[PDB]
Design a protein around this nucleic acid. Structure first.
Lengths: 119, 285, 92, 47
RNA sequence: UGAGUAACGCUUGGGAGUGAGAAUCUCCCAAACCGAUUGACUAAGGUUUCCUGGACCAGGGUCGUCCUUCCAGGGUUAGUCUGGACCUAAGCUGAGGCUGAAAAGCGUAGGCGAUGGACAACAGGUUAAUAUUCCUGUACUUACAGUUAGACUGAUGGAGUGACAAAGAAGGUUUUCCACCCCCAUAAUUGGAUUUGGGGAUAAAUCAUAAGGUGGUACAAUAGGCAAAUCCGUUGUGCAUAACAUUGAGUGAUGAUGUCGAGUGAAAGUAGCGAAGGUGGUAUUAAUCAUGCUUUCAAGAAAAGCUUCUAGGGUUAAUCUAGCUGUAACCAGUACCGAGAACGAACACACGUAGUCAAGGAGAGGAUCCUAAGGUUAGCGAGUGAACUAUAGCCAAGGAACUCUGCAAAUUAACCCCGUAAGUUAGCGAGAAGGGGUGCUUAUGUAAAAGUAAGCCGCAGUGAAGAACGAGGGGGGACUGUUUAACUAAAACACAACUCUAUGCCAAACCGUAAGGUGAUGUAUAUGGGGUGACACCUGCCCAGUGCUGGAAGGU
RNA sequence: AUGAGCAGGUUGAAGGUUGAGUAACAUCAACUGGAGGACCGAACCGACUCUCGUUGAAACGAUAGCGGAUGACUUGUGAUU
């Protein structure tokens, strides 16, 4: 046993979760593996809950979850979210997004799931 | 003069003694000239095709042997003066540059006890017996310091031309031929009474005192360390073999060719040189 | 020269680009039994006009038709780039 | 590490090249043997 | 059959497109680190693997709409570059020849043969190419012949030159870096504020100028380098102390109203445009001077080439040089990969290697970690957190109780300041031991600094990463080093050195049979062999036998 | 035979210059010197060890250390047995 792939790690999970939260921020609708969705629902619901406080400290805190994208940039996303999107999700206590089961992947039979967000 | 000093080595000790080369000479830098130089290269002790001939050759530094002249018949009796007595690394002695008055510079093996500036000259006629002077043996008296003696009428000097080596005259024979010499190496012969011999004693009497010190210095002088004959297979060295350091068990152990070498009569007795022998490390003749 | 060391020109879009250049650069497949001086003298006797510049490269026998039922090798062909004087041109 | 065989074209063309074998009669006789074997690889050129 | 078993041969995300078909193809943007390497120059090699478009019978450890796969087509340009036409080194061959049944080995003249010597252009540009090879500019050289002019040269031969180590050191030299300016751009909310990023150069060739460096330079006669000498050798006078022969970094101007440039940047980041284009110190940096200089011994190529000497001669001229003009520059290479999936290695192999250069931050430094440039997706994946199995992170407590064992692991580690024992053959011992401190800010501090004072903080201050666990006793071996490619690398081997012996020239010896060669181009202070085997004192009885040597009579 | 190369940090030697010093030696101080089959320490070499791999990419390998690493140095090229 010697040099091989590092495989999944807790840190790998952390970066991967942040990359999908940035991606769904850029898009809103995602077609991914269900398992990452069920792992990232915690962070996404807590972000929806904590971004509703809507202050500069919340901007600092949510800065630690976004990346640089091609469809937008980080700062205009901060503006748009804190202006209309995060306040929009105050109607219901919990149960923010829907992760609905698609078919499996053609390659290795990985359970596709569609992630969308409505209140 | 040899000197040995602590080399500040932190792994073992050595005995490397070195000669000054400075208080005995000019400034210590290799000074070459384009006049007389023929290079000599390591032969590795191998034949004209590649098979072994000599034992543990190579390891030394490549040198250009200075062209040292011994014919001493091209220019004689015309005044000359030594220019620079200097080392010859391809030999064991120091060599001297001399300039014959026609304007000809050459090298010659410098014997012991000669200073630069004094005029020296090779003459085929009765002259001084000062060391370094060259004489026909028909005009030499008994008991003089002679070195680098030839065996032919101009066959080149061969005997007693290593550092601190010479020979002594025993006068000439009763009949007046084959001048008698008390040979080095505990021998005694009678050379031609007409040989051209140069009187003196080859320089560097202290070359017997220099110590290699470390095996690496020995290798860099041109010697390859080799395993002893006993620590060998029973073939390619007959006395090799044995499990657990079996020493020699036979009298007079053998060489790698399996030949006796303890005191055995080994020389070529049927030589022409043997007929002219008084003492040859043994009895008469 | 012998003039037998000139087989054919080669023409394509890259050859279009070469010949439309101010140097009048042409490329020929040629028989390699001649040196640059000999090739340019052969061209100097095929029509009687001296060329401007002569250079040569070769293509070694390469595997022809790749891997197939009957594969083989190509030929050793010399590509000579010969430039006419910058003002002269031929109409063939 | 250090390979037993190297693609030294020049070294091989000097060791088992045509002229290295034609310079000796034994090489020419070996070539006659190969002739009798009808081989396709004969020498460095007719390989 | 074993059977879906083991494995998928060092590794990703999301979105979108094409596509009937997507983890596997790509478009966008992500992430990941290397970065003295995942860079680039690349040498050799494999030589088309390099490119465009089509599809992917075969293969891609799955995948395949795609690939170094195939199909069709196509790509590599040298007057100055490498090696040819120049050269020799190791070494090799070798007629007429030594020479051995035949066959063959040897080697003269001759003829080959780098791993070295000598040799005339730079930048930029282009396109699917690749290019000091093609081109824009500015160049340069070589001959060839003609021409004019100066106008005696000089080999084939001699001589100088070519033509010489390693190692150290400090000068100069431009850089670099920094202080600093210019210019481009820059103007910011989330708390606080106008702030940070980048650039600033320009060659070959020419001259002017080469700081300086090396090391004798005019005269006389010469005794000599087959012959030949004015060249050289050559002894004096003289300039010696420097005239002189030689030479050289660097600076400036042409080159260049150019390239390039912070960058700006239309139908592609492309067509176009394009400021600054600098100052001073520099305790770092670096390479030209430099083939410099020096220390030392184990003392460091020739040939081609350049010139000279007389030669050889000619002088109704040759030759050389100068100018001008014409002419021309022939042979093969220029793709791509190229310390690896294009070399091999059985291979998409986690495998190993030629040279060269290789940034910023601290750092002595290529140590260390992250980034600059460059470059990236290691051809299977997904679910899960059972046993068992690798790796780690952790462990309290004892602190060798386990073992055949202190095997493993561990405290140990960087810097600064100390101090270090006995013994020592005076070198060492000795990172001895053992300890103290390292953070920040404000100042003192010099040129940065090393340090010092005041205050402050932590749970600790290479606050990350990179760093010895010792002391003593006994045995051998002295020892640094070589060894069983590939189970055990040492107390084995080697060994300096000691001892003994043998060996005197056509040396002995060794190879071969001789030939021939090494020995050896050696010469008893040289070499071999046989034992020992840092250093010190010794090497005690015995020649019975034999071994070796010797001898003279004699039995044979 | 011909070439190339081996960061840096160290420690600091033989030797030598001046002086003290001795009638002269002798002895030592200051200074230069920058070598050591010297030390680390890189690249690199080899593989002493713990473990793993055990039809492994591996027909000698994977990391961690480890003995060196300017000399008993390596290599490159050709040749030679």
């Amino acid at each position: 046993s010697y040099i091989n792939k590092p495989g999944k790690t807790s840190a790998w999970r952390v970066m991967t979760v942040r990359q999908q939260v940035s991606a769904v921020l850029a898009y809103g609708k995602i077609e991914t593996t269900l398992k990452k969705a069920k792992n990232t629902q915690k962070r996404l619901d807590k972000l929806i809950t904590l971004a509703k406080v809507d202050n500069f400290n919340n901007r600092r805190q949510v800065k630690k979850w976004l990346l640089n994208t091609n469809l937008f940039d980080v700062d205009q996303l901060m503006d748009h979210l804190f202006s209309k999107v995060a306040p929009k999700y105050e109607k219901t206590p919990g149960g923010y997004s829907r992760v609905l089961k698609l078919g499996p992947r053609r390659g290795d039979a990985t359970e596709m799931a569609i992630l969308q967000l409505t209140d | 003069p040899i000197k040995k000093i602590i080399s500040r080595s932190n792994s073992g000790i050595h005995h490397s003694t070195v000669i000054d080369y400075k208080k005995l000479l000019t400034t210590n830098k290799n000074k070459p000239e384009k006049s007389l130089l023929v290079t000599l290269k390591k032969h590795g002790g191998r034949n004209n095709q590649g098979k072994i001939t000599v034992r543990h050759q190579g390891g030394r530094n490549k040198r250009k042997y200075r062209i040292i002249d011994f014919k001493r018949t091209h220019y004689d009796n015309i005044e000359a003066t030594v220019k620079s007595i200097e080392y010859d690394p391809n030999r064991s002695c120091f060599v001297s540059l001399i300039t014959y008055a026609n304007g000809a510079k050459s090298y010659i093996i410098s014997p012991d006890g000669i200073k630069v500036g004094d005029k020296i000259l090779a003459s085929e006629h009765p002259i001084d017996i000062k060391p370094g002077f060259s004489m026909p043996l028909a005009f030499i008296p008994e008991g003089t310091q002679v070195h680098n003696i030839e065996l032919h009428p101009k066959g080149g000097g061969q005997i007693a031309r290593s550092a601190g080596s010479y020979a002594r005259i025993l006068g000439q024979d009763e009949t007046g031929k084959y001048v008698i010499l008390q040979l080095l190496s505990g021998e005694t012969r009678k050379f031609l009474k007409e040989c051209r011999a140069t009187v003196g004693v080859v320089s560097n009497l202290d070359h017997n005192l220099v110590v290699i010190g470390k095996a690496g210095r020995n290798r860099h002088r041109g010697i390859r360390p080799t395993v002893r004959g006993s620590a060998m297979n029973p073939n390619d060295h007959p006395h090799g073999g044995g499990e657990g350091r079996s020493p020699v068990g036979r009298d007079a152990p053998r060489t790698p060719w399996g030949k006796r070498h303890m005191g055995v009569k080994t020389r070529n007795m049927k030589k022409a040189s043997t007929n002219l022998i008084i003492r040859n490390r043994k009895g008469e003749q | 020269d012998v003039t037998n060391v000139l087989l054919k020109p080669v023409l394509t879009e890259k050859v279009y680009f070469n010949q439309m250049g101010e140097t009048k650069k042409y490329v020929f497949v040629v028989n390699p039994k001649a040196s640059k001086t000999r090739v340019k003298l052969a061209f100097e006797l095929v029509y009687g006009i001296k060329p401007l510049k002569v250079n040569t490269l070769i293509r070694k026998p390469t595997t022809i038709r790749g891997g197939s039922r009957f594969p083989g090798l190509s030929k050793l062909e010399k590509l000579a780039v010969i430039t006419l004087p910058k003002g002269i041109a031929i109409s063939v | 590490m250090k390979r037993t065989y190297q693609p030294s074209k020049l070294k091989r063309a000097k060791t088992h090249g045509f002229l290295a074998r034609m310079a000796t009669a034994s090489g020419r006789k070996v070539l006659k043997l190969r002739r009798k074997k009808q081989r396709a690889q004969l020498t460095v050129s007719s390989e």
